[PDB]
Amino acid sequence: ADCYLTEKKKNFIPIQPMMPDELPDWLDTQDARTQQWVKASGFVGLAGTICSIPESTGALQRVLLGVSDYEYSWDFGGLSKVLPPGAFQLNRDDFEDDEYYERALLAFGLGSYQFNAYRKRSPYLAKLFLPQAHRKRVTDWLTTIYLIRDLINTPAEDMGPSELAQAVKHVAKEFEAKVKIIESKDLETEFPAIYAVGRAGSRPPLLIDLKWGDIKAPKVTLVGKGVCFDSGGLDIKTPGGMLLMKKDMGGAAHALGLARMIMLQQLPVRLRLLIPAVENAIGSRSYRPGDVVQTRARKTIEITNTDAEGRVVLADALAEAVKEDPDLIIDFSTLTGAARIALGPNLPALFANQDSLAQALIDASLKTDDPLWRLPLFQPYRNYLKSEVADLTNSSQNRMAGAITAALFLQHFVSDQIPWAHFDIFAWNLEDLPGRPIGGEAMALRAVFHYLEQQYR
Amino acid sequence: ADCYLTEKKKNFIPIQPMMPDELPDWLDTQDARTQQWVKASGFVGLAGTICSIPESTGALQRVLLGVSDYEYSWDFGGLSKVLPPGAFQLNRDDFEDDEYYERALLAFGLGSYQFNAYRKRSPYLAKLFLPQAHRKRVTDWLTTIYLIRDLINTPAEDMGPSELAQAVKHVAKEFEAKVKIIESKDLETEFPAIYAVGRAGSRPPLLIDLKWGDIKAPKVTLVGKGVCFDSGGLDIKTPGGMLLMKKDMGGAAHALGLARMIMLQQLPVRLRLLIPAVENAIGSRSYRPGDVVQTRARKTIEITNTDAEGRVVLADALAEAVKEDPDLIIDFSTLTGAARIALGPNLPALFANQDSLAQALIDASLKTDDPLWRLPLFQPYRNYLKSEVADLTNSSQNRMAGAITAALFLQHFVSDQIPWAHFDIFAWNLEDLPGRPIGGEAMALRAVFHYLEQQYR
Amino acid sequence: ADCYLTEKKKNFIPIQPMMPDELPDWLDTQDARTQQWVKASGFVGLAGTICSIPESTGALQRVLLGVSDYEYSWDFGGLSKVLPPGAFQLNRDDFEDDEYYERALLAFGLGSYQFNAYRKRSPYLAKLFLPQAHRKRVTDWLTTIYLIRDLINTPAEDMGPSELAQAVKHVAKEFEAKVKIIESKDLETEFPAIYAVGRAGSRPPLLIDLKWGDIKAPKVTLVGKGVCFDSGGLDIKTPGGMLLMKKDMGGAAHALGLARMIMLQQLPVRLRLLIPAVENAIGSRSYRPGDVVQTRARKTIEITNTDAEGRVVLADALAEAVKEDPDLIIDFSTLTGAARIALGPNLPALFANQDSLAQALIDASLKTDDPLWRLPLFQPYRNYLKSEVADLTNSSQNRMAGAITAALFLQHFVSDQIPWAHFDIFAWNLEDLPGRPIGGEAMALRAVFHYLEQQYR
Amino acid sequence: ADCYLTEKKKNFIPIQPMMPDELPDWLDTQDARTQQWVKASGFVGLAGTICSIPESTGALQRVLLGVSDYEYSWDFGGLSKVLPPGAFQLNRDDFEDDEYYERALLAFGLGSYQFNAYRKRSPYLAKLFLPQAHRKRVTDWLTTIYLIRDLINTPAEDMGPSELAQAVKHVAKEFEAKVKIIESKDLETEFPAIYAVGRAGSRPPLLIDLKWGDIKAPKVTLVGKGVCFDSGGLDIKTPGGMLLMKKDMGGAAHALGLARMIMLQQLPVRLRLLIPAVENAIGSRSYRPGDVVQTRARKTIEITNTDAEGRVVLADALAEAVKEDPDLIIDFSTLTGAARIALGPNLPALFANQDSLAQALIDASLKTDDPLWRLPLFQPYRNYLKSEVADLTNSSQNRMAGAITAALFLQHFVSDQIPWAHFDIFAWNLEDLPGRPIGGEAMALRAVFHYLEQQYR
Ligand SMILES: [Cl-]
Ligand SMILES: [Cl-]
Ligand SMILES: [Cl-]
Ligand SMILES: [Cl-]
Ligand SMILES: [Li+]
Numbered sequence A, B, C, D: 001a002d003c004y005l006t007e008k009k010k011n012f013i014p015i016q017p018m019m020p021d022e023l024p025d026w027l028d029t030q031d032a033r034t035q036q037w038v039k040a041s042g043f044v045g046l047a048g049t050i051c052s053i054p055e056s057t058g059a060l061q062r063v064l065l066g067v068s069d070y071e072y073s074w075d076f077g078g079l080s081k082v083l084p085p086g087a088f089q090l091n092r093d094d095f096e097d098d099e100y101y102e103r104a105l106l107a108f109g110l111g112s113y114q115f116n117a118y119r120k121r122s123p124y125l126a127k128l129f130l131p132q133a134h135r136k137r138v139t140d141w142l143t144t145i146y147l148i149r150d151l152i153n154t155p156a157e158d159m160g161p162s163e164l165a166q167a168v169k170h171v172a173k174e175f176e177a178k179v180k181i182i183e184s185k186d187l188e189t190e191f192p193a194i195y196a197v198g199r200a201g202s203r204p205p206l207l208i209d210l211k212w213g214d215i216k217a218p219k220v221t222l223v224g225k226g227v228c229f230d231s232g233g234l235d236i237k238t239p240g241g242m243l244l245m246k247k248d249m250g251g252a253a254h255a256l257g258l259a260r261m262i263m264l265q266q267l268p269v270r271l272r273l274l275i276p277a278v279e280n281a282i283g284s285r286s287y288r289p290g291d292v293v294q295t296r297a298r299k300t301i302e303i304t305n306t307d308a309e310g311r312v313v314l315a316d317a318l319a320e321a322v323k324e325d326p327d328l329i330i331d332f333s334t335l336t337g338a339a340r341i342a343l344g345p346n347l348p349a350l351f352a353n354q355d356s357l358a359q360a361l362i363d364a365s366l367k368t369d370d371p372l373w374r375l376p377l378f379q380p381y382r383n384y385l386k387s388e389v390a391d392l393t394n395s396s397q398n399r400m401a402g403a404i405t406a407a408l409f410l411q412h413f414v415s416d417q418i419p420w421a422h423f424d425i426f427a428w429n430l431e432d433l434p435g436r437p438i439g440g441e442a443m444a445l446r447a448v449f450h451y452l453e454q455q456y457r
């Protein structure tokens, strides 16, 4: 949180949003030198551009930031990369509501992110004042998003199942949450599907199970796909397909981040977090096409694609989650394969077995401007998962309906009587955009958290 | 054998074959109600269709089965899937000879097959009377074909080299045949080519060697390719190519099934069964392109395709078989690669080093309606197996003549003075056809067994 | 060296080079029978053809060899394959200079090469007299080239890191050079990049470090890529691409061969030879796309292609070489991928960080007729190696400039103040050409050695 | 040329290059306000960054431009995209020599380029003063480079053979050069290879032949590949491979641009420009693999790749050029296929049949900082062009040595006695770099022109 300043002072440099239509009238309120400079600079209010205005001394008086709209917020994410050095401040009066003011404060922080575990990088020299009224909420979100980005960005070699388990225990200690790690023989017996997928890796598979909160409160259970590296297994990926696969544990990072926000904000729920943590490797012990994998739910799965492993490990975590008849289950899973990204990289897919839940999450998406889109649990496609040998296959007969297929698979492990939402996310920025550096990224969480606050407070 | 009834009774429901041309005259011999019903039902004798005819009580009086011809037999294979519940019987008088009657009885049983090791399935409710005169032969064949289907259908995870060895020992116990298992260090020294192919798998390679019969009788030696799973090795298969690879031990299943029939029927031969049992895996210990593998025959093989492994392991089994100067050697091997299936999936390829043997097997094929087709050991193509480093390569320079190439490779290990037949089989039903459920399948065996009975009785 | 004779005699059969233009005048100097025979034979001096001329007894009098030019030399390489049996001799007077005479003597020997470790081969029956004045130089070169060919030709199974280390120790003993082998834990700590690449193989990685010569002499350090087998790693090669990969240690063979010539000829230098020896394997422990590998130079490398492993292991050897501030560093590395072979298979690429060195090597290439061609360390392409996570990536963003990219990568590990030459070589004959049998081959060494003799004597 | 100002005035805004090391001392010479502003802005001299400094009025006083070095020049190319509106000027005293001053002036203009034939674009608002002493040279180059960029950027539909011929005639009129267009039946008879390649297109093929200059002066003949669109023909390209193929006439654009500079600068030569202009299309009339194409040189070419068409059409233009025994022939051809771009996209390949010519062009490259690199006409690779049917094939047997192969093909049409240089160029900017907008680009020309001025003045 060193991109922010917390001691209030009367000498910070103001940053003011501006749109083209308001610039002429605003200039009329400024002195001669300011009017000449803004005109001489060529600044006209284009989104993402800035105009650094000098004092008569030559020091910086103010920075104008062109915005797409006064309620967009992400334009503020680009500030660290363009701002001159200094201590800056935003003005509450420049925003329609405290909510947009808080989003701008957070966007600034998100755009200041640099993953520096493997190379030295010069930190940005612009810092922003964070008012006490918004400090906890902005800090809680920034630190949680930074954690998600860090976990996804860490190379698989340094972020295997053990390291993921350690990260969960680190988060748990801050809130005295309890963590159980299911490994080796107990995993092999109790969670056979997690074991089958991860048994070929040099780093053994495990299940992370965290609990927190009042035992009398409604049970909210979060599940996240922790495939630390996905080679595809014997159905090996192409090089282009394998290049970003350190991110196939993005669902686990999201589930852990959401858990962290719930604990930071002390939501009145009984929280449980389940993360199957494995590597989908190629080697002498690899599970094979045609193999039948047993499950904790006592269903048999015929493996028709070793690279559709995420849903297989999630099936066991879900079977465990449902035993408690929780009030809500939410899972986060990363998408793999160019064709399965039906909604593109920046729009998480939502599946839900109950319409009220789906609609409430859609409403939350709009309120938070954290996009998501519902896809269907289209029942006729269950036929694509038909097996002549086992209860079902893990992948479909065709290259169509990939996303729906995975979600329908998981639905076999969750009763229609338990409210359940499944998120398919990309968890990565392919391009450098304001507030969104190339690499791991958090998505859907603000929407989900908003929903939880509305539902449980 | 629970699809059959063995206590003869006077109240079974008759099943009668019928062709369109005979239906009008047959109807003239029936009562009014029967004539009205057959006409009202729309049954006209189309192959595979049935007409269930009621008694005046509403119980079932008879079932007509449309047949392609009165000597085709496989139409009877579709009965379990369409018959109403009950105890049925065929009539010997409806067939030209006891041979067609027996084939119909067997086809019924073959179509009643359900592989249920991994899912619960409701058994068929129609059963057929099996007359005492045909009981042993039909049972012997049904149980042997079921065994072949079961072994092929079992996922590789549950059917590795050890499990295959156990299956052989189970069959051996019934006839007090002797079984030797060559493993680990002795295999590494004595059968280096079997070891090289299988050394990368987590389940180690072995050679199964079964013997039965009078030591004074003619030696018939059966050899079967037991590649429990074929990933292709470092020359990895495509996903479509690897999907059915649990079946790459189909040759071993066939050789074991043929051995079982020989023992059940007490053919007067000295039987030996040799099965190299391995997994062709990808891992740290995988044999590589360019590696030179030593053989039991003391020939060197340069590996030019790690996915042409079946012939490499068979070479050692054949080198062992020839040492005894047997009267006959027959090998069964499964085909891999869409392009190598020159005769399609339902027509086994036969290669033989002696013309009399090939012609006799062709004759047996026609007598049993168990199709096979001869392909040539075309000597000029030996040049395709030329190596600059070793005695020969294991695969050819081009993508043509795949089948011939494998057979010519094996011929280097078998003297022209020892009668030898090599069968390339697909061992799988891609589609659900009457009497032939999707999955593992037996082929060529009835023809081969007929030949053996004619030759050795 | 059994293709040569060392006891001088007056009854050897002369082999005489001939071009079409000189044949008519030469024939005029011969007897009637010789003139009739040469005309009757159809010999006209075409390059590579011969005319065996009889004595009146029917024994062989002389052999004419058609040559492309009197200074080409390689036509002599085809002699062992066409010569009748016997003891032959060349005539010094048939050559412009002793240099061409010596090249012809050597070419004869090079064309007599047969790799017979895995199959029996009949040796050639023609032998050539080697005069005492040229015996040491021709023998030194022939034995060194044979060694290079043998190491490259040996299948990877019989030429892993340990076997390569043993070969180096065998060469060292002859000259009492010292050899250190860096393995296991010390390698893991001190040469982490060599370890990361080779850790997945069943045969562990190591670094071979040989030293010889007067400690007061100029330091010449040779570095060679010893990838004993390259599967490509998780970014697995195609079968066609993996077929010749036993040759991916060709750079190590070249560096060892050059070291051997330096020691045989007692060049007044302080020689050091560094060979990273590893297998780039696929298995449970394989390094992955996205992994960040530490280096001896303390730079971080983001792995964007597991099949660009040679430069990664070389980086550690180079970082070690530079610590001594040597007078010269020369590395040899084999090319992988059809598209990276910009200069084709028979023209080694030279990169050098100092223009004088590059020009001197180019001059040496022309003097020795051992072809090489300079490619550029084009600095703007360093941008292709940009990483968002580490100091640099190991491979570029596109499929262009492959060779330049590898060389620029290595340049990050070598100061511009240390003269350094990097050779990208194919190290293999795809076709059987005179003096150049299919399989491993030595290239660039005569040019490099000539340069060293000119520079250090 | 509207990015430049030509009336000298005393009120232009100075643009001054600056490096980090000189900034502290420079600041010491400035007033208080300027020192405060430069420090407050965060400008430290990083290449490509600017610092707009205000006057006390708020108008712009000066712009500092960070440069990679004082002799690099391309940093000036980025100015139009970052400069505020205004009339600017450079200072001659800020450069080591008039040559670097002139390059900076030109780079500014090159970075102001916008291709607007198909969309409206706002022009840049910064203009630069162009001093009279450098006006002609800078204008001549800018207009010529703009022409090259425009021709390459024009979609193939609007830049077919006819449009290319029209562009040549437009350039010719300005200098009263003569132009002959060889079409239809005369082309079919006289230039059969140009006709064979282009006959399938809906826009017929032609040969453009321009002449200019004193008939007594040395003959310099320029040849350019005018493949207006390359589909690959029956050997059809992949979509990625065909996407930029409107640029396959880049060689023609280069040859025309070089011709234009020669005429603008009145070089004392007899200039001839030959451009085969065709579309390589797929349709009913497409030339085929295996077809033998006749040539103007009376050699036969067996077509082994319809997508190696550029060299086929160039062969006829070259055969025509050589008939006059010119003093020099220079051809420009665009590269096609990711693997053939051995030197990457930004480094043109030079081939030359005479060493003095190649060395002189290399020297010119260094003097002008217009990069090029020599590749070899490696004679042993002529064997790759062997045909069993015709005199030679148009493409090689392998996927290696692509560039060398094309150049060796062309060499069959040009005597070693005629000095000849062949340039393989990419002619496109894949990325937006300072002074180099995405799309068509000129390369190698400044080097070639420098050589011509040195050789012929
Ligand atoms: Cl990660
Ligand atoms: Cl099986
Ligand atoms: Cl080798
Ligand atoms: Cl164009
Ligand atoms: Li995955």
Ligand SMILES: [Li+]
Pocket: B227, B230, B248, B280, B307, B309, B310, B336
């Ligand atoms: Li196989």
Ligand SMILES: [Li+]
Pocket: C227, C230, C248, C280, C307, C309, C310, C336
């Ligand atoms: Li390699």
Ligand SMILES: [Li+]
Pocket: D227, D230, D248, D280, D307, D309, D310, D336
């Ligand atoms: Li082209």
